[PDB]
């Protein structure tokens, strides 16, 4: 049993970039459950083998981490093109890890055939014809199927909480008590405005000391539907492996998602936040049944409640420590089910 894992649209080298980090974490968690796996990328490296130096059909299972396949100006993006050429040569089922609703599997040929450099490729070379199984992070498979209605060879769908991988790593460690410098914190990108309403609601005009780290910038928030006056402080992005430590700088950390994530996706940030020294505050809409933690104090319905909850935490250090103890306890209860999680992953990839 030989497994190959690749990122469909981002080069993989080390932990200096997020897509690379995620692919390496998955390679590691899969290796940690006793499986033989190789990461195949553009060139040979510490964690990778080159597409040009291996035969894709020498692998019994091909796993693909979701990515965008959009092309912009300039030279051909080989991270996308070489990955799809590799996939096109595979003669068995492909397992697509679908962790972001906006990144469904899609054929690149349609987006290539019109480009000025289109002559460098052929349909036969890029057209992926193998059957594809989508492993969905979201429990609602209808939302996953709708995202793939344009691709004909995607014939199987199965739910699996892929992003729990961060808490199951052999070197996992809870964040320790940290000197606080912020009231509320949130790390992420602008996600093309797919979550602007919630970001403005909970992070803008709160009167609190809030920081928004990641690729997002203040000037991106200009949707007339969601006006604001005072924005949180925006700082640059940090390595993925430093996220929980960053969250720990604040008294509380926010959990929000895209509309289609509500009561559907339990994202990586849930785990990065739960494991941090920051109290996890969740948008009520994101988890209406309180399945993450059965304690209403961890949920906020709107800006007003977030402000009240944060001030209650600032006022009582005991309340803060108590809630932190509760969320760390719940996190460990899930880590205690690692065996079941590993077995479910193996089943998802037909092992
Ligand atoms: O500076 C940053 C900000 C974010 N992240 C990662 O990006 C994720 C959030 O991605 P996104 O903004 O797409 O939000 P999501 O839809 O995952 O909630 C976080 O959980 C981290 O893993 C990171 O590594 N560095
Ligand atoms: Mn995500």
Curated annotation (Swiss-Prot):
This is DNA beta-glucosyltransferase. The gene is bgt. Monomer. It holds the Pfam family T4-Gluco-transf. Catalyzes the transfer of glucose from uridine diphosphoglucose to 5-hydroxymethyl cytosine of T4 DNA to yield glucosyl 5-hydroxymethyl cytosine (glc-HMC). This DNA process seems to occur immediately after DNA synthesis since the DNA alpha-glucosyltransferase interacts with the clamp protein gp45. The glc-HMC modification protects the phage genome against its own nucleases and the host restriction endonuclease system. The glc-HMC modification also protects against the host CRISPR-Cas9 defense system. One of its GO terms (molecular function) is DNA beta-glucosyltransferase activity. Pathway: Genetic information processing; DNA modification. It catalyses: Transfers a beta-D-glucosyl residue from UDP-alpha-D-glucose to a hydroxymethylcytosine residue in DNA. It is an enzyme of class 2 (transferase). Keywords: Glycosyltransferase, Host-virus interaction, Inhibition of host innate immune response by virus, Restriction-modification system evasion by virus, Transferase, Viral immunoevasion. InterPro entries: Phage_Bgt. Its EC number is 2.4.1.27. One of its GO terms (biological process) is symbiont-mediated evasion of host restriction-modification system. Disulfide bonds: none annotated.
């Amino acid at each position: 049993m030989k497994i190959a894992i690749i990122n469909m649209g981002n080069n993989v080298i080390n932990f200096k970039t997020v897509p690379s980090s995620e692919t390496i974490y998955l390679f590691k968690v899969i290796s940690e459950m006793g499986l033989n796996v190789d990461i195949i990328s553009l060139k040979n490296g510490v964690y990778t083998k080159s597409f040009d130096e291996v035969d894709v059909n020498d692998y019994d299972r091909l796993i693909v981490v979701n990515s965008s396949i959009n092309f912009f100006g300039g030279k051909p993006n080989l991270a996308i093109l070489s990955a799809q050429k590799f996939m096109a040569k595979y003669k068995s089922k492909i397992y697509y890890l679908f962790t972001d609703i906006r990144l469904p599997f899609s054929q690149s040929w349609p987006n290539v055939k019109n480009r000025p450099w289109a002559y460098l490729y052929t349909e036969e070379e890029l057209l992926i014809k193998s059957p594809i199984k989508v492993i969905s992070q979201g429990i609602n498979l209808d939302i996953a199927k709708a995202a793939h209605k344009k691709v004909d060879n995607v014939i199987e769908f199965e739910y699996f909480p892929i992003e729990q991988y961060k808490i199951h790593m052999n070197d996992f460690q809870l964040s320790k008590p940290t000197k606080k410098t912020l009231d509320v914190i949130y790390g992420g990108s602008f996600r093309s405005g797919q979550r602007e309403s919630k970001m403005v609601e909970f992070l803008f005009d709160t009167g609190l000391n809030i920081e928004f780290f990641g690729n997002a910038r203040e000037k991106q928030f200009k949707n007339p539907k969601y006006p604001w006056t005072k924005a949180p402080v925006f700082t640059g992005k940090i390595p993925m492996n430093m996220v929980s430590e960053k969250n720990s700088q604040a008294i509380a950390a926010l959990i929000i998602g895209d509309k289609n994530y509500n009561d559907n996706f339990i994202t990586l940030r849930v785990w990065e936040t739960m494991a941090s020294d920051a109290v996890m505050l969740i948008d009520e809409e994101f988890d209406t049944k309180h399945r993450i933690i059965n304690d209403a104090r961890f949920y906020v319905n709107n800006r007003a409640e977030l402000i009240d909850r944060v001030n209650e935490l600032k006022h009582s250090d005991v309340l803060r420590k108590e809630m932190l103890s509760i969320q760390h306890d719940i996190l460990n209860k899930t880590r205690a089910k690692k065996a079941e999680w590993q077995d479910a992953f193996k089943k998802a990839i037909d092992l």
